[PDB]
Amino acid sequence: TSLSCKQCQETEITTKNEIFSLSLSGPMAAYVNPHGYVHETLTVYKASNLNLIGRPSTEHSWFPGYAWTVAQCKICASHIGWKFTATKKDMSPQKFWGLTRSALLPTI
């Protein structure tokens, strides 16, 4: 139960027992960005070895209620996913992560 950066390979990002379904039609979804490109994601509660980058934004957020910040590998600066943060106190969970499945190992 261990998932790692695909590019540098050594770095543990998260474990499989951190996965959860917030699509509610699965933990694994696919979302389209503004330019029309499709990203196949995986929602997890917790992840580490990630440098965040930029302010949280809600421009075209895939989870309404939440804002997204870009996330990268500490080591190789490879784009892993985004971190989602709630915009009010009442929501739950308050924060989680949406990771690119094709950026992790093993890919599932």
Q: Which residues are annotated as a binding site for (S)-thalidomide?
A: 60, 62, 68
By CB under 6 A, the residues from 25 to 44 that bind ligand A1CAW are 33-35
Residue 82 interacts with ligand A1CAW (CB under 6 A)? yes
Residue 29 interacts with Zn ion (CB under 5 A)? no
Closest C-alpha to 27, from 37, 41, 46? 41
Residue 105 interacts with Zn ion (CB under 5 A)? no
Q: How far is the CB of 1 from ligand A1CAW (least distance, A)?
A: 26
| The two structure tokens encoding residue 42 | 């995986």
Contacts of 22 (CB under 8 A, 6+ apart): 43, 63, 96
Q: What gap in Å lies between CA 20 and CA 1, rounded to an integer? A: 14
Residue 8 interacts with Zn ion (CB under 5 A)? yes
* 3-state percent breakdown (helix, strand, coil) of the chain, nearest 5: 5, 45, 45
The single residue among 3, 5, 44, 68 that binds ligand A1CAW, judged by CB under 6 A, is 68
Annotated binding residues for Zn(2+), as ranges? 5, 8, 73, 76
Positive or negative: CA dihedral 11, 15, 21, 27:
positive
Residues that bind ligand A1CAW (CB under 6 A): 33-35, 59-62, 68, 82
